[PDB]
Each structure stands twice: as C-alpha cells, then as structure tokens.
C-alpha cells in the first residue's frame, strides 16, 4: 500500500502549490515514476544482484569491504598514503579466491571502471609533463591486466575503454621498470588471443597507433637524452611498445586477421 | 514538469547531460499520445491528447532540447524526436505554427545548427563492418550485436528524425517550408 | 616526574602489580583548567593493562601507587607524557597533564 | 521597577489566569503575547555587573583614534560634564608558572608600590583616567628592554591610574578600598 | 621585549607594532543578561529542626557555555540569540569542524570529538531555546564525525544485492502478499551481503593506537531513543503550527532532526518495532499530511526513497529464495 | 615615472579618469539579479561568460596584477600624498579597492581563469597582511579557490599559516573560515593534507577559537545574617557555625559535583555581593568578595590553593566542618573535623555585610549546626567566637534566602524585583 500514499503525496503536493527549488520536485518526480513503473527497479536491479553460497562468506565480506575502501578512497584526493592504501586494496582483492571463483561478481560490482576512473584521475593533470605516482598507475594497470585476463567476458568489458587508454598510452614507456604495467600492455591483453576482438577492433585507433609510433621514430625521448644517452636520431622503445601493440592486434592464435 | 525540463534544457553548459528522469519521462509522454466514427472519434482524441500537453510548453521544450545538443546523437535526442513525432502525429497545424512562432520570435541559430549537425551523422550502410561481422560469424558462433549488428548504427533513430522533419512540413504549411530553406 | 594529590583515600591496601589490568574512571584536563579528555562522558570505565607500554608513562607510574577506590590528581609533565612534540590535534607541545583518576576495580 | 519595586508580568498562555482579558481584549481581535506557545519567554532584563565594552564610534563624550617612530591610540572629548572611566586593553598579558613581577617606571625609576604576586594568572593593560575639556592622555607600547607600555598623560594628573588588571567589575569612584586577601 | 610580542603567535619581532585586535575597551554599562527557564529547585526542610537547618538538592541541572579566551570569560550558549557576531561566527566554526572531517577521515575526528565534547551534542540536540542555526550546525557535526563514514560506506553498496544460500535465506519464500495484506516497508528478514560497522573507542591516552579506521564511538541506543522522542514531540508540535518552533522558524526544527533520522535508519538500526513505531508515525490512513516547507519535504523524499529501496531489496531476496 | 625616482612631475597620471574607468568595468562584470526571468538571466551570464574570456584572452588580468604591485609599494594615503600629491594620496585606497574588486569580479564565475592564473597565488597571500585591502584579497582567494580544484594543489603549509596568522591578528572574521572550509574541500573531494594542516595548526592551543564546555548549574544558600564593623557600635568581631552533610555523590552526571562553604563579602553596605553575575558555575570563591573551603583547596577569587590538612579529603557523607570569624586582626578560619586547616585569608578588605553562605551543584543534602533551638553543635567553638543564631538581630526573624534573587523554580508567578536601599541602617544628638 505504500505506491497508493506516495503517489497520493507526490501529486497532492504539486497541485497544492507551484514547487521552487527544482531539486525537490525532480526528487519528486523520479519517486513518482518509481512508484508507476515498479518493475523497473526489478529491471534495473536484477543483473546486479548475486548468489555464492552459504560456506564462502568470510572471503566475500573482506572482498566487499576491500572494495568500498577502493571507492572510499577514489573519493578522496590521490597522495602518497593514499595511493598506498589504493595499492594495499588492490593487493588483497588480488589475493582473494572469490575473485577467481566468481568472475561475473567482478564484472557486476563495476571493479574494472572503478580502478579505470581512479587510474584515470592520477593520468590527469598533464599529458606530456608529469607522469606522477608511477607505482599508483602500475598497480591499477596490471590489476586491469589480470582482471581482463582471467575470463573470456572481461576483455570484451575492457575493450569498451581500450579506446580512451590509447589516447595516453604514451605514458609509462622508455623506462625498464614496468615492462607488465603499462596502458598499452593492458590493452594488448584485452586484445589478446580473441578472434572476435581482433575483428571488431575497427580503425579509429589504428591510424593513432602509427601515428605514435612515426612520431617515436622520428622523435628521440627527451628524458633519455637528459639521462645522457648518446641522441640517436629516433627513439627505440616507444617504438618497439607500439610494434609489439600491433603485432597483439594483427596476429591472433597462430592465423594473421586478413583485414587488420 | 515540462516547465523543469524546459529550464534543465535552456540552462547554459557545454555537453547535454544523460537526464535519465528526461529520458523516462518523455517516453511515457510519447506513449500518452495515440466506419467513419469509429475513425472520427480516434482522430478527435488524438488532438485531445496532443492538446493534453502541447499547450503546456511541450511544443517549445522539444524544441529547446533539441538546440541544447548542438548535432551528438545520442539517447536523449534518440527520444526527444520520439516525443515530437508523438506531439505531431497528423497534421497538426497548430502545434506547427506554435514551433514557427517560438522559432521566429527566439531568433536562435542552436537549433537548425544542430538539426544539420544531427543529420550530417546519422547513419550509414559499412560494406567493410559488414563482411567483417559476416566472417567473425563464419569463424565462431558470435552473437549477435543488437545496434543492427554494427553495420547500420540507430536507424530507427535516423528514420525518426527525418519522420519529424517531415512531421514539421506536412500539409502544405509554405510558412515553415521556406523558413527550413 | 609525575605526582600523586590524593582527593578521596582507598584504604590503600591493594596496588597496581606487573600483570593484571585495571579499570579507573578518569577526567583528563589541561594545565589552564580545559578540558580535552574523559571517561565519565561516553559512560564506559577505561580498561588498561600495568606495563605493557599502551598508555602514557604519567598515567602508569601514577596509578601503579594508587589503591582501590582512591581518587588522585596526578600531575605529569610534557617529557613523561607527550614530549616536545605534543598530541598533533589536540595537545600543543611542552603542555603539562592533569588527570582527575578513580580507580574501580583492579583486575 | 525603582528602588524596593516588586511586580509581576503575564505574557499570556494562562487564560484562566488572566483577569480582565474578557473585560476588554477578548472582543476587539486583541491576542496575548505568548498565546500560542509551547514554551514561556526567556525574560532578558538589565544586568548590574558593567562588564567592560568596545568603544562604539557613534559614542559622545568619548573618541579614540589611532595613528601609525612609535604606534599610538589617541584620545579625545566633547562634553559639558565630567566623570571617570575605566580603559583597557584587549588582550591580556599572561603569566607562566616561574615569572611574577611588575614594576612601574615614572619619568625618572623604578618608583612604585611591589605588585610581584601571580603564579598564573593573565593580566590586562588599563587606565582609569578623569575627563578634562582636553584629555590626550593615551597609550603607546614602547620598548627599552622588555615588555614596556608607556601611558603618556598630559595637564592635570594627579588622580588617573594606570596599572594591569585580572577581570574585574566595578564601576565606582575611589582610589583604593578595592578587593584584596593574602592567602596563608 | 614589547606587549604585543607576548600576547601574540610571533615573539622574535622586535618592532611595535599593533594589531586591530588591540582596541581600547571601557567599562560600559549597555548589556543584557538573560534569566534561565530552569532553575536547581533547593527545597528547604522548612521544619527548623533541634538538629540543623536542612537544605536539600537533588535533581541535576547543566549547561553549556562558550569562553572566549582573550576576555577570558564565560557566556551562557543561549546568550547568542541577542548577539549577531558570535552567533554567525561559532556557526561557521562549526560548519568548519564538519568539513575538516566531511570525509572518511577519522584521524581529525578523532580530535574534534574531544575539542567539543561527547555529550555536549546530544545536549545541544535536545535543547529546545537553540538559536537555530547552532542547533543546524551541532546536528550536523554529529552527523558527520560519527555517522557520516559508515552511513556513505552503507550507502554505496544499497545497489548491489549480494545474497547467500542459507537456510536462514531460505525461509523469506512467502514475502507475505496473499491472504489480503501486503507486509510493511523493512520488516522483516534480510540475509543479504552488507558491509559490518565498527567503532574505535576514542582515547588518548593510550600511546601508539593500532589504526583508529573506522569511527570514533558513540551511544547508538540513547541516540535513536532520544531520536523517536523528539520526532513525536516535533510532529506533535507542528500539528498545532505554534508561533516558536524549536530553534526559530520551522526548518531549523525539522529538517536537522529528519536528516538525522534519516541517516539513522540508513545505518542499520531501529529493529522491526522501532521501525514499526516510525512508520505508525507517518503512515495512520501524520507528517505526510502536515503543510511542511520545501527543505522538509525534500527529505521526506528521500526517506521515501529508503522505503521503497528496502522493498526492492525484499522482493529479489524472496526471488532468490524461490529460485533456490 | 614617479615611483622610480625623483623626476619633475609633468606626467600623466589620470588618477579620476582611472577611477571612473574601474567603477565603469566593475559594473560591467555585474552579475545578474536573482529577481529576474531565467532566460534573461542565463542570457546575462552568457554574455558576462563571454566577455570575461575575451578579457581574460588579452591578458590584462596580468595587467593588473602589475599595476596593484606598482601601487603597493607605498605604505599609507600619507605616505602616497607627500609624493605623488594630494588627490593622489587620498584616492589610492580606493583605486586600489576598485581594482581587488575588479580582480575579483573577472574571476567570478569562471573555471579557466583560476586555473589559469593560480600561479600567482604566491603573491596574493604574502599580500594577504597588506592590512588595508586583506578584505579584498581575502575575497579573491575566495573566488579562486571555490571554483578551481587546480589552485588548491599548490597550497602548502606556509600558505595556511599565513591565512591563520592572519586570523588570530585581524580578529574573528567569519570569512577565513569559509575559505578554510573551501581550503578543505572543493569539488566533492577532499584534501587530507589541508585537512590536517587546518587541523593541527588551528585548534591545538585553543586560544582559538572559540572553546566552549558543559558544566554544571551551582546555586548558593545564605541565612538572614549581616556583619559589619567599625567604629561604634560593635557585634564582637567574632562568629562561628558549624555544618555537615548527610548525603554525597562525587560525579552525579558527568562532573564533580561543586560543594563549597564560607563566607561571602557585599558590596558596600548593601545587598548583592559582586562576583558571577547570576546562574553560572561559580559559587563562593570564584570572586573577590567571596572565600569558601571545600576539603582540600582554599578558594579566594576563582583561584585554589592546596593546603596541608590531617587527612585531607574531600567533603564526603558525614563530614563536619567548622567556620570562624575573626574581624579586625585575623581572619575567616576553617577546621575540618575539628582539627584546623594550616590557611586562611589574612589582609582582606573588611568593609561589607559578611554573612556565611554555602554553594553546592546538585545531590546534597547539607545542615547548618548553630546553637539554641536552630541546632546543636558538635564540637567547642573557640574562646570569644559566638554564633549566628545570636549574631541575629533582637526581635527579628531568622530565614535562608539563596543568596541574592529569586533563583527559585516557579512559574511566570515571580515577584520580580528592582534596586533596594542599604538598610537605610548600614550616636546620641548633640
């Protein structure tokens, strides 16, 4: 009975009085079409629900609690403590076994666009200037890789931003620190070893890739030549990143795509 | 409501938000909408249901959510055109002389801008999508991709669209037809 | 460096020893009479162990002299209780301590 | 009320109580003050300590200017009748355990009465000057060695006072008779 | 070396300056002093007896008041109705305290817990002669240096249902509907995935405290009972519409106590009959039929939104349990 | 010209031109009224929009900046006068007012200018203490700070000292405290760093600001006794009364309940002795024209001092004190179970009624002890020291008002009272 008194309330109020403060009556609005339709919320909501089991409840609970420290601290500007509680929950969502048991509750709790909106705030700021918290931006990378890597459906997920990463895919390269963690690296994992990815990986991103990679042989790294490398004329390591990108995408299980 | 919408839409910003309240509102606004009694009677109701909203800034607010997405395609216009082909089933004069009016006596350039920038991405037939989604099929049972399996993206919307521009001409209203040239 | 006023006596007979826990009801406050701590507040007795290094070595020297049901101003000074560097918040440094204890029960 | 004046107020509330609300009030739309409330008035009234005040500038018979070499607050009047005030100072000064002493140095030394007793406490600069036609006494905070504020009078100085003071609340004229104890 | 190098933050300044704090003050006679709506009540035995005069006090009474420093003297909390300066500034002290610990940042409320009180809010929550936009702004710091950290932890995971396949699970498969009743909005059982609460104990003095994580603690029971009681005093209050809601006009009395209603039945508490005798509040077919202003309603909403969100809840656990 | 050194002054210096000019563009960054139709108001802000990047594009927002620095190398109107001349020196004040408003006006609204010009936060807040615009760069950083997240990462610690400093100097000013409020959060998102910079650096010392505290409502009971000396007629100099309790509770709520006794001085000759004003948590001892004892400290003008006693204890249940009087050489006395404290208070101002007087807070049950049919003494008074109950008047009664006025829990049914007289009694004819 409580659709009847809110839908009552809802349109009583209105036809009382004319309603200031468009909040209110937009909150209002929203509650009356909730109350209409009713299963949408059963719609909405039906995908996002979950069952495990009554014996892995321990694990599943510091998962949950992991996670909300994630999105707690997503929430917050990005420091050093920061960043080594963002590393720290990373670890132990790592670490956790429903991670692998349940692979579709990942992809329900939305994990990968929360790590994705959080790498994305510390890859701000600058583009070609500042590449602050390499740790902050590694870890969220390769948790993006191993996310991705385990499954069949989760690199499909990924593929959705791999079109945003390749736009700053320049960043982490010429430095042998971090030959797994990398933008790049993370979309050659979700581009890996799937024919259909390969496929309906189409050329709005191709062009950029070669782009990049003219630019890395016609360019030498400018933090080489101020660590005091010789200046060759064009730079090898960007340049073997995005060969090593292309080849990802155009050999695929042994058989080259026609078309790529 | 249509007074909140029309002032979401008119506020000054750079990109139209999602306005997922927008975007369930103007569907049940568009689905309100729709022998010779028995055909009389249906088409005086329709006018009664149209009049039921289009006298209520309807006819203005479609219009003005239109202008404030300066040609992107996306699921607020992709429904905005469905409520302006629901407020304009038939030949409904009177709500295309209130849209002549309103686009006379506002003289903005944000909606024929955009109506051009709208049209000029609407969709069209890819040979290549196509034999590429013909032989990921070939290769493995890959479903299927429900935006016309990726070779014609939102044609139900392009045939809106144009169903609205021709909704705006139809009889023999000369007064819009030269103001759309 | 801590001292012990005694305010109400506890028929100082039975004393604070290496391994047991004590419950006191305490009103900590400054030097200049603001208060910046309590137990009687949130209604709940502090529990703490003798020795174990978990509070302040003017609060644990002091009430290892006192007695069961003896009330005791103990006076600390900054080095015996925060240092030179203070509680970062709330107690500024080189700032003296005064603690309003009751011991309840010893355990 | 006056001297010895005892009364009473009704704000309403109480109709039962009221007595000649039905003789005149009752009928002419007149309400009582507190009719609808749930709970009675505060009941501010006039307090008799005078605590001291900023000074106010749309106050007569009392300016204070300030000027800025040395920084100063002059003064100045315009009045037909004359009295004695009481001037202070904003911020105390306070005294930490190991320091207690005050010596007031005239024109010439160190010629005063040993006022050298705070464990810890927080005095406040004052002087309690008489109002001439012209009074230009003021305040300036100097420096010779230490803490030093000079309050430069000027005609007519025989009965202003000049001295730190803890909190203190009484307006009289008298030059000693004030509040003392020694503790032993 | 000089007076306002000694009263102030700099003392290796050698020069004299003043600063505009430094003003002359006189002692003036222009104050007002506010009398007390309640008094100690000392009952004397009135007999005389052969043995002593009794005087006898037994109910308590207290108060709470602001010190300023530089005066270095006390004010009653009520005193600031009259005041315009220190009413709008201890306000934005307050409004200050709340946002220097908005967030999940506890180890500054850890602090400000201490730097006002423990029951100083629950006093200036159920004070009835607030100034108004004190009591506003001690709500909300209540709000925010206890509740505010497991109310949004809560919060963000209200989307997500996450439930086990107990047999405790598998009792909800009825989610009473026939027999012509429908069950009321909360009642009832839950089983489902919800992140646990935890509050730390605030103490300093224990040295080295192990992480301080989640909150500082705080009576939850006294809170909500202390909660219904004001509401229903408040409901009771505005069905008559007086001319001296509880802290001046009608929004400084109900939207502070509705919003922490609100964020209370958010966190997990009122169990099946308090949430019972919440509903019994706005539901007899109240609050919803009152003429409430626009900030109120615009949190009704909200609470109305709670409401259907824990039915929606309902309904896919007992889909879950039929599905079993 | 001017300002690099001294030169012969045939410059230009259109000091009302400029003048009139900032008050023009101040008002033409005026943002639209509130009381104004929607269209027309966002109609407005897009023009102000526009026009403030078409400004902000040219870049004399710099411009500005440069002529602000130009003119704060000066210290005062007079200092300005006798250099750059008399209308010079009065109207730079408010050429500098004009152009922080200006500053202030330009930046507004917009999310790029802050951005944009952050790097010269350095300079506004070591202007900040310019003590004659602070106002006005106070408002700037303001409108800086609340619309750019940008600006706030290059706010260090000297940065919040500097705005603090400038609080404790400038006085309470609500303004600091909404830009410590949008130093603490901008958009959504906090920063942890200011937040506890603000934290530690604000509230550790408490002088601010404001602190405030609960305590408890102590009241104060008095008998109908008054005592004053000089020359004349004479009442001995000399009283004592005993007193005990029944009943104590050391923390009845949340605090040590207040439970002091002595005697209380007057003003003059006159009812209401000085002290707390009325209704606060001071009882006798908490002024100087009180002095109560209260077990184990002497209190005498809100100040205690601990003294030595055979047992020193507080007030507890069955505990009997004992108060003497001495007027003209000694003073008040107090002995605790009969056996004398090693206080008192010497050298106190004797003109006043003085008169004995108990404070207490809440659960107390407390006698007074005289002689006669009011009580029974406990022990032996000292030799000379009579009573109350024969300090009392002849042909007079005897009753315990509170202390000064009606603290009494009543209804609206108060008898509310104005000034008295002095007795109109505190010689043969000739």
Not at chain 2, 113 to 118: E, V
Not at chain 3, 22 to 42: A, I, P
Request: aromatic fraction near 8%.
């Amino acid at each position: 009975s409580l659709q009847q008194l809110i839908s009552e309330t809802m349109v009583r109020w209105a036809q009382e009085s004319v309603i200031e403060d468009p909040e209110l009556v937009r909150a209002m609005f929203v509650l009356l079409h909730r109350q209409y339709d009713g299963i949408g919320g059963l719609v909405r909501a039906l995908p996002k629900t979950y069952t495990i089991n009554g014996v892995s409840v321990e694990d599943t609970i510091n998962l949950l609690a992991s996670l909300g420290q994630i999105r707690s601290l997503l929430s917050v500007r990005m420091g050093k403590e920061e960043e080594k509680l963002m590393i720290r929950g990373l670890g132990d969502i790592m670490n956790n076994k429903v991670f692998y048991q349940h692979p579709n509750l990942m992809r329900a709790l939305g994990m990968h666009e929360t790590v994705m909106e959080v790498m994305v705030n510390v890859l701000g700021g600058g583009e070609s200037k500042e590449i602050t918290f390499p740790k902050m931006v590694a870890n969220c990378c390769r948790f993006l890789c191993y996310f991705c890597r385990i499954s069949r459906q989760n690199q499909k997920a990924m593929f959705d931003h791999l079109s945003y990463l390749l736009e700053n895919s320049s960043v982490g390269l010429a430095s042998p620190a971090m030959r797994g963690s990398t933008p790049l690296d993370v979309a050659a994992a979700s581009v890996m070893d799937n024919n259909e990815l390969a496929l309906a990986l189409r050329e709005p991103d191709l062009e950029k890739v070669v782009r990049y990679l003219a630019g890395c042989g016609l360019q030498s790294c400018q933090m080489l030549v101020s660590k005091g490398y010789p200046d060759i004329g064009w730079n090898p390591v960007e340049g073997e990143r995005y060969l090593d990108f292309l080849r990802f995408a155009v050999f695929c299980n042994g058989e080259s795509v026609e078309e790529n | 409501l249509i007074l909140l919408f029309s002032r979401t839409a008119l506020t000054e910003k750079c990109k139209l938000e999602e306005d997922f309240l927008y975007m369930a509102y103007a569907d049940i606004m568009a689905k309100s909408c729709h022998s010779f009694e028995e055909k009389e009677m249906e088409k005086q109701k329709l006018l009664y249901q149209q009049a039921r909203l289009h006298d209520r800034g309807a006819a203005e607010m479609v219009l003005q959510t239109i202008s404030a997405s300066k040609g992107e395609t996306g699921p607020m216009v992709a429904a905005t055109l469905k409520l302006g082909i629901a407020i304009l089933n038939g030949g409904n004069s009177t709500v295309q002389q209130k849209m002549l009016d309103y686009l006379k006596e506002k003289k903005d350039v944000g909606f024929f801008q955009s109506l051009a920038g709208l049209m000029q991405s609407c969709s069209v037939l890819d040979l290549n999508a196509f034999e590429r989604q013909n032989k990921a099929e070939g290769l493995g049972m890959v479903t299927e991709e429900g935006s016309g399996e990726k070779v014609l993206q939102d044609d139900e919307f392009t045939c809106d669209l144009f169903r609205f521009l021709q909704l705006l001409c139809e009889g023999h209203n000369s007064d819009f037809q030269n103001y759309l040239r | 460096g801590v001292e012990i006023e005694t305010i109400s006596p506890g028929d100082g007979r039975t004393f604070p020893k290496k391994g047991q826990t004590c419950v006191v009801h305490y009103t900590g406050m400054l030097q200049n009479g603001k208060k910046f701590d309590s137990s009687r507040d949130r209604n709940k007795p502090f529990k703490f162990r003798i020795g174990k290094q978990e509070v302040i070595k003017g609060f644990e020297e002091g009430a290892a002299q006192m007695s069961l049901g003896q009330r005791a101003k103990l006076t600390c000074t900054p080095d015996v209780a925060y240092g030179a560097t203070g509680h970062p918040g709330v107690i500024p440094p080189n700032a003296t301590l005064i603690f309003d204890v009751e011991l309840l029960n010893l355990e | 009320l006056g001297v010895a004046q005892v009364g009473r107020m009704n704000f309403g509330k109480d109709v039962s109580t009221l007595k000649y609300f039905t003789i005149c009030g009752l009928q002419e739309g007149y309400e009582p003050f507190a009719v609808n409330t749930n709970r009675d008035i505060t009941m501010w009234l006039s307090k008799r300590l005078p605590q001291f005040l900023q000074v106010p500038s749309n106050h007569e018979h009392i300016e204070v200017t300030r000027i800025d070499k040395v920084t100063q607050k002059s003064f100045g009047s315009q009045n037909n009748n004359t009295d004695i005030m009481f001037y202070r100072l904003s911020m105390p000064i306070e005294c930490a355990x190991x320091x207690x002493x005050x010596x007031x140095x005239x024109x010439x030394x160190x010629x005063x009465x040993x006022x050298x007793x705070x464990x810890x406490x927080x005095x406040x600069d004052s002087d309690f000057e008489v109002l001439m036609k012209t009074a230009h006494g003021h305040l300036v905070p100097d420096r010779i060695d230490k803490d030093k504020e000079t309050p430069k009078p000027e005609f007519n100085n025989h009965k202003d006072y000049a001295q730190e003071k803890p909190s203190r609340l009484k307006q009289x004229x008298x030059x000693x008779x004030x509040x003392x104890x020694x503790x032993x | 070396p000089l007076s306002a190098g000694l009263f102030k933050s700099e003392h290796k300044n050698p020069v004299p300056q003043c600063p505009p704090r430094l003003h002359v003050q006189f002692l003036s006679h222009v104050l007002w002093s506010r009398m007390p709506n309640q008094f100690l009540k000392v009952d004397v035995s009135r007999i005389s007896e052969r043995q002593g005069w009794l005087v006898q006090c037994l109910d308590p009474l207290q108060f709470m008041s602001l010190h300023i420093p530089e005066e270095n003297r006390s004010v009653d909390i009520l005193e600031l109705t009259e005041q315009e300066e220190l009413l709008q500034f201890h306000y934005h002290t307050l409004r200050l305290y709340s946002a220097v610990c908005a967030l999940g940042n506890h180890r500054v409320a850890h602090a400000l817990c201490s730097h006002v009180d423990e029951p100083q809010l629950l006093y200036a929550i159920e004070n009835k002669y607030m100034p108004g936009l004190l009591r506003a702004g001690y709500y909300d710091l209540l709000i925010d240096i206890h509740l505010s950290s497991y109310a949004t932890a809560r919060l963000m995971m209200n989307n997500e249902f996450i439930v086990p396949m107990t047999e405790e699970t598998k009792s909800i498969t009825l989610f009473p509907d026939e027999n012509k009743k429908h069950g009321l909005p909360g009642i009832g059982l839950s089983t489902s995935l919800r992140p646990r609460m935890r509050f730390s104990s605030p103490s300093f003095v224990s040295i080295s405290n192990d992480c301080y994580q989640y909150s500082p603690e705080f009576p939850l029971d006294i809170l909500k009972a202390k909660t219904i009681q004001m509401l229903t005093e408040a409901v009771k209050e505005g069905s008559l519409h007086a001319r001296d809601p509880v802290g001046g006009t009608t929004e400084f009395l109900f939207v502070p106590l509705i919003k922490l209603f609100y964020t209370l039945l958010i966190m997990g508490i009122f169990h099946n009959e308090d949430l019972k005798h919440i509903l019994q509040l706005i539901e007899p077919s109240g609050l919803l039929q009152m003429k409430l202003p626009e900030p109120v309603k615009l949190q009704m909403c909200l609470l109305l939104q709670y409401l259907c969100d824990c039915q929606v809840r309902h309904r896919i656990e007992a889909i879950v349990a039929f599905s079993d | 010209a001017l300002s690099k050194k001294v030169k012969l002054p045939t410059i230009d210096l259109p000091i009302e031109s400029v003048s009139l000019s900032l008050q023009d563009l101040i008002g033409y960054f005026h943002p639209p009224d509130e009381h104004l139709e929607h269209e027309d108001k966002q109609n407005r802000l897009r023009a102000l929009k526009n026009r403030q990047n078409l400004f902000q594009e040219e870049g004399m927002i710099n411009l500005v900046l440069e002529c602000i620095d130009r003119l704060h190398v000066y210290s005062s109107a007079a200092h300005f006068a006798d250099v750059a001349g008399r209308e010079a020196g009065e109207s730079w004040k408010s050429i500098l007012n004009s152009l922080y408003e200006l500053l202030a006006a330009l930046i507004r609204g917009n999310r790029k200018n802050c951005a944009q010009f952050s790097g010269s936060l350095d300079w506004l807040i070591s202007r900040l203490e310019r003590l004659e615009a602070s106002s006005g760069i106070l408002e700037v950083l303001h409108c800086v700070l609340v619309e750019s997240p940008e600006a706030l990462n290059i706010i260090k610690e000297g940065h919040i000292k500097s705005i603090i400093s400038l609080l404790d100097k400038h006085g309470r000013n609500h303004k600091v405290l909404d830009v410590l409020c949008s130093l603490c959060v901008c958009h959504g998102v906090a920063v942890r760093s200011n937040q506890h910079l603000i934290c530690d650096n604000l509230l550790p010392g408490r002088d601010l600001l404001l602190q405030t505290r609960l305590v408890n409502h102590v009241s104060s009971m008095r008998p109908n006794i008054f005592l004053g000396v000089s020359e004349g007629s004479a009442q001995y100099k000399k009283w004592y009364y005993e007193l005990m309790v029944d009943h104590t509770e050391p923390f009845v709520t949340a605090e040590a309940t207040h439970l002091r006794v002595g005697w209380a001085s007057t003003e003059g000759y006159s009812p209401y002795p000085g002290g707390g004003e009325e209704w606060g948590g001071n009882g006798v001892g908490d002024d100087l024209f009180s002095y109560g004892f209260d077990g184990l400290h002497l209190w005498s003008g809100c100040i205690a001092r601990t003294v030595s006693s055979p047992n020193q204890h507080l007030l507890r249940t069955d505990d009997v004190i004992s108060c003497c009087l001495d007027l003209s050489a000694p003073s008040i006395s107090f002995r605790i179970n009969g056996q004398p404290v090693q206080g008192m208070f010497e050298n106190f101002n004797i003109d006043g009624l003085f008169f004995p007087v108990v404070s207490f807070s809440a659960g107390i049950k407390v006698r007074f002890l005289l002689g006669g049919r009011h009580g029974e003494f406990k022990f032996l008074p000292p030799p000379g020291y009579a009573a109350c109950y024969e300090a009392v008047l002849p042909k007079e009664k005897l009753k315990v008002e509170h202390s000064r006025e009606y603290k009494q829990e009543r209804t609206y049914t108060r008898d509310l009272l104005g000034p008295t007289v002095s007795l109109t009694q505190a010689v043969p004819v000739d």
